[PDB]
Amino acid sequence: KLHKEPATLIKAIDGDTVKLMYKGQPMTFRLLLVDTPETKHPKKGVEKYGPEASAFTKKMVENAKKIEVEFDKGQRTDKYGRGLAYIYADGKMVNEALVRQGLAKVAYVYAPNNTHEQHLRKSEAQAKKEKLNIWS
C-alpha cells in the first residue's frame, strides 16, 4: 500500500518541482503525473500560466505546517536524480490541487507509477468543465 513520509521544505523551484529535505538529505522532487507550464522550460522561454502554476505550488508548500511525500509503486527517482512523488501540504495533495485549478494537465502516465491517475483525470475533467486557466 502507499504511505506518506515527512519531509521539510527547502525551496519551491517551479510549478512541478520542489526541493525538500528528505531523510536528512536535500533532494529535488518532480511532482508525479502532472505537467505544469514552465518558467524554467529548457526550450521555449517562460510559458503562459508558468508564473501562475509556480506561484500556486510555492504558496501551497510555503504556507503548510506539515509537508509529506508519498512515493508510488514503481521507480522513485527519474533519470535526472529527482524523486518522483505525490506531495501533500497539510493533507492536501499539491499534484491534485494544481490539476483542479487548471494550472496543470495530467501527464502521459507510466505504470506502475500510476496509482492516483484516475483521481487526477477526474479533477482535470472538472477544471476543463469549469474552463479554468489552461482551459479558458
Side-chain angles (χ1 to χ4, degrees):
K1 259 74 169 71
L2 304 192
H3 72 115
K4 292 170 180 57
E5 298 177 58
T8 307
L9 181 65
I10 292 176
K11 184 186 187 273
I13 288 163
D14 216 358
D16 69 350
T17 306
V18 296
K19 208 184 287 190
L20 308 175
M21 194 69 78
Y22 172 71
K23 292 193 289 57
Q25 71 242 235
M27 277 195 83
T28 299
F29 285 80
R30 172 74 253 255
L31 297 183
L32 274 174
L33 305 199
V34 308
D35 296 315
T36 66
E38 283 179 60
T39 67
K40 279 124 67 69
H41 175 281
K43 290 87 62 175
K44 59 189 106 119
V46 184
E47 313 173 81
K48 223 302 112 289
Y49 293 106
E52 288 72 11
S54 277
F56 189 91
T57 298
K58 183 169 200 293
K59 65 153 194 73
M60 198 164 174
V61 297
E62 293 185 341
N63 296 137
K65 310 201 277 182
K66 296 153 263 72
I67 293 175
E68 299 170 300
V69 301
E70 184 179 59
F71 292 101
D72 209 330
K73 309 176 297 288
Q75 51 263 88
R76 292 175 165 43
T77 63
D78 62 19
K79 63 192 179 73
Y80 294 97
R82 301 184 282 185
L84 294 177
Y86 301 110
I87 292 188
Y88 293 87
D90 292 330
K92 299 173 209 68
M93 198 201 300
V94 178
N95 311 52
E96 188 278 329
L98 286 163
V99 173
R100 183 61 178 92
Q101 301 286 318
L103 292 171
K105 240 190 181 285
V106 175
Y108 187 97
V109 191
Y110 303 94
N113 283 345
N114 64 188
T115 296
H116 293 317
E117 175 184 31
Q118 283 314 127
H119 185 55
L120 298 185
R121 318 218 79 130
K122 286 183 178 182
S123 297
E124 187 188 56
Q126 194 62 226
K128 187 150 59 277
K129 200 174 296 154
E130 301 176 5
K131 305 303 271 276
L132 294 175
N133 296 303
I134 272 181
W135 308 118
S136 60

